[PDB]
Design a binder for this molecule. Sequence first.
Ligand code: SF4
Ligand code: SF4
Lengths: 459, 459
Amino acid sequence: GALRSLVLIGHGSHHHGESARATQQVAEALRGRGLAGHLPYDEVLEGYWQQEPGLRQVLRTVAYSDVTVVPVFLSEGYVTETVLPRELGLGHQGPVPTGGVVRVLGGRRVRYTRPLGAHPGMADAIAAQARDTLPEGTDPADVTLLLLAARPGNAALETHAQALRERGQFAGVEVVLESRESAVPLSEWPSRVEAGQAVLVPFLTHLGKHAAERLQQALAQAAERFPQAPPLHVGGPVGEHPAVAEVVLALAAEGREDERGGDIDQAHAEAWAALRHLAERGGRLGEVLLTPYGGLFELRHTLDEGRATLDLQTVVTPEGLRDLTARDEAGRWRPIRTWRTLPRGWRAVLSPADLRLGLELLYPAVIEESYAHEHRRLHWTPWMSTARRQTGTLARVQRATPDQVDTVAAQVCASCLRTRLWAGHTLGQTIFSGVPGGLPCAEACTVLLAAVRDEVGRE
Amino acid sequence: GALRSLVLIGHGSHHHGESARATQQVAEALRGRGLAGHLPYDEVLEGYWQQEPGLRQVLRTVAYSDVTVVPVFLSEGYVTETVLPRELGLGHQGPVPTGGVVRVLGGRRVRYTRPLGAHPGMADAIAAQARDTLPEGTDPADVTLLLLAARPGNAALETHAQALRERGQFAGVEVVLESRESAVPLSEWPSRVEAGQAVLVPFLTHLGKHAAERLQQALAQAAERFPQAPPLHVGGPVGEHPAVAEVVLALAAEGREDERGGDIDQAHAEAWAALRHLAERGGRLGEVLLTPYGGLFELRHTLDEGRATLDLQTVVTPEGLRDLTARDEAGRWRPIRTWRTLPRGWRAVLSPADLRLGLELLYPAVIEESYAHEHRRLHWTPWMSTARRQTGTLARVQRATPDQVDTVAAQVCASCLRTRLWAGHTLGQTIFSGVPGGLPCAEACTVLLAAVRDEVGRE
Ligand code: SF4
Ligand code: SF4
């Protein structure tokens, strides 16, 4: 009853899975330590800007009254200083204090940290990535370290670069930058490597395919210009290296003000007790069938009821269930997990201990929002409140007519299991009073907002 | 024990519902009479070119071994002479003579008639619509009868226009043409009227919203060009008039070489015996929950399991159920009824006598195909064979590579409940083995053919 939640925030995407992969990797590694007894947290949850579990939903999902939120982002700017605290409801803008933003929201102590890329331990993670990218014999002393920035003035990266120069285990360290579409152009890298070899580490959480193409073109330009250039070993993005989890832990601690921890959140616990009572009877939630299976719980798609075990792909972890359900049957990403697009073909066998994380990853926010609606205490947010928060390209949703929003919502939300309470639709029973398809929507989602944007820009 | 089936064939659509409502209106009227005892057919079924029940499916749905197929088309031309016979598998092209084309296919004797538009009874239906359209005091001999054709070469309508002149009930009779996108265009109609009034009857099964705006547009042009034009009364499409049912009956009767009749098709009868068995125990079929309800049956969406009965819209006829499931929750047409897009919010209560029609209109061909697959005898048609039947802009599907079709099918078919047997996908268990989402796909559908056409076109 000194209990604490860690939340990790990633960018996410409507379309590309890689963009959640760094957050999901680190989350699972830290839970792993929790299983082993070396985690100063009692749970590790995820939230995303551009998919579910969303920024607006993530504090509804935390089990405990003491929460630490760490941004798994490598730059300090718009997204981290404006977008994430605004969507989180932290009422803060601009530079984050070292040590973080401390708030009281819900019945909850929340502390929002500086981003991952700001922590000095990122210099260690870079160096480790670089050494792991080399071939079995090679003295780093003979290797020049190239650090690939995503944008021009990443002040943190320059700092890490100078730390690694001083520590002196590389022949040299250069910051490289791809051109358009002062740091050294990647297309020129051999002009800076007079002897030995080079190694490239992207200072990136991940590498999407357009980005990867920009990069290999840059390198092909280099090689055309310098046809006998040093051997170059190209690493993966530092955001996927195992060391980032240790950096996340250091960031999470620095700035902590109170050492007491928190307590369990009662509303949340009540929701999950109801969920357990249902799982024990057997029951259905969305497109998922839950079946007690001795001392375990099986989950499968309701369409796959009665289907032979060996005609299914079985998993036995919450994470493997998440992964199997991340894309639809065409292989396309599912950013809104309540969409009526859950793929067939899978089975999950879960321990009683793992059931909650399993459902929370499969259907984020649904157990808690449903239970709250069942008991008429789900408060929802009108379109106007949502539209008025948006900045960037999304601010334009503010000039959508109520006809435009209804028309777009009719089309978008038809794909979804939820009922759009924020648009005046009503929901009388939920998953907790017998109805598998009875799920509340409390607020216009990121896929709806983008569609309204597009409609508004069509003129 | 002389048993016979009538099959009505319409155009249908991927996107719009009018193009089937004419066929559905006639079919439903004729089933009503068959209960009043006043029908020479023991069932009335539907099939469509561009939606389910499709031309490839409809004959497998017929209960009897003697079948009459009437095209509800107001033309007699390439579509009725070449396309419908080719898709139905009749082994016929060109002119169909009065009395039909007779074939033995499967176990059935099938007679394919001339189209609705070719029967001389259509003059009576046109006159009746004309009379109904006049201010009900009006005297016909004071009125010029204008007949709107879709396209220029409607020789059948010209035949009728001449019969109606000879009857003489009207001041005169002229054909005019829908606007492009030597009978005179509708925008010139007063050039063909010498009486002091006119009545326009569209020789169409239906009038979509596009074509309706264009008709209004043409009428505005006529009114400017001819400020002296007399008053025009505008009737709806003749295809929607109750008098068309009597013409269909007359067409069905012409040429029945005999008055013997047929027997029950045993394969079809077996599949419905299997379904009845499943129904008395309660079962799930795709996205539908089938429950014994005393001596009737209840159907609802599986997502609505447990939902309060009074929160649902109740229907009690197969046709009502069909109408309520015709569109998705965005109001978009569902041409392929096995798509995972069945709307929520309804319940059907059906007598045992209505169960089969109910299920056949809700999910065309699913019962029979599923039954046949479990008995290891569902015959599938390979892609290249489908592609090769096609003509026009659609023949372009013939250019798609195996990878191109595999790529489009993964994207399109992801929306579908069915498993593409024709593409080498296998299905080990169907609805009849207790798997709600186990449904076979025996042949590429019109929605997938159009998607492959667009892909080839884009590349
Ligand atoms: S806004 Fe619409 S699509 Fe998004 S979660 Fe809500 S109901 Fe679903
Ligand atoms: S071709 Fe694909 S979308 Fe069409 S009915 Fe078959 S499985 Fe369904």
